[PDB]
Design a protein around this ligand. Structure first.
Ligand SMILES: O=C(O)c1cccc(-c2ccc3ncccc3c2)c1
Ligand SMILES: [Cl-]
Length: 242
């Protein structure tokens, strides 16, 4: 069962923002959100799609391991961190689109489509460009669907090797200390309206896991830091992190 906690809206309103946060208590199998409607509204995954893309590239041998270097093609793009060599860890950390567009081309439409159906990922529709459908194509996914996919990955239940799933979960590592571990992936969709930011992942505790997925209206790149800020305020309010 799902519970709607509209008090979280305060964290969005304080920044004149609109969005949704969805949480899932794994131990209790209970979900919580500030907006049931938007939690079930499907959006472009944008760079959150690098989770399934990584999984598929690894399982098919397109990527040998997390150390294989993907060389910069020398074409200068306006994101400084993209103009250099990367491996799977750094490409994920810096959301390096062009590296993953190359992953997608080597996967191919047929294998990509079959894999996303096996993952039951979003609408499973890669209609459009094989290498950009997650940025301007037809694939859509909601916050609650993100959680369901993430839960399978955490439990190694996706239809790829255990090894592929362990490597991707390593690459998702975002923050860790004595209080919690966060494995997550950001997203920023700008080529189709409405422009939004994503943050999806989970919080590991000593004896529980809290999965989360949030998106928010992102008319300008200036509010990107709010994806994490708002999520952590919700996590603090719910006593999940200090
Ligand atoms: O957050 C992501 O996952 C992501 C993924 C791909 C691109 C960007 C991005 C693009 C333009 C920016 N322009 C200004 C400042 C920051 C910017 C970030 C972010
Ligand atoms: Cl790890």
């Amino acid at each position: 069962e799902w519970q709607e906690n509209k008090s979280w809206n305060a964290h969005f309103t304080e920044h004149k923002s609109q969005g949704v946060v969805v949480l899932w208590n794994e131990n209790k199998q209970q979900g919580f959100t500030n907006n049931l409607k938007r939690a079930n509204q499907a959006f472009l995954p944008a760079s959150t799609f690098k989770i399934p893309n990584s999984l598929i590239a690894l399982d098919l041998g397109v990527v040998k391991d997390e150390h294989q270097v993907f060389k910069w093609d020398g074409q200068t793009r306006d994101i400084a961190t993209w103009n250099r060599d990367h491996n799977l860890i750094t490409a994920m950390k810096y959301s390096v689109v062009p590296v993953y567009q190359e992953f997608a081309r080597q996967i191919g439409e047929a294998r990509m489509s079959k894999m996303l159906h096996a993952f039951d990922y979003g609408n499973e529709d890669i209609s459009g460009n094989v290498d950009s459908f997650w940025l301007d194509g037809g694939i859509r996914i909601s916050a609650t669907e993100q959680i369901s996919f993430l839960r399978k990955l955490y439990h190694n239940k996706l239809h790829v090797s255990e090894r592929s799933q362990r490597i991707v979960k390593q690459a998702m590592l975002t923050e860790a200390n004595g209080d919690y571990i966060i494995r997550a992936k950001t997203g920023y969709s700008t080529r189709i309206e409405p422009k939004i930011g994503w943050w999806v992942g989970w919080v590991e505790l000593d004896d529980n896991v809290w999965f989360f997925a949030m998106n928010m209206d992102m008319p300008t790149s200036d509010g990107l830091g709010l994806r994490q800020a708002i999520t952590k305020e919700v996590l603090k309010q719910e006593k999940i992190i200090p």
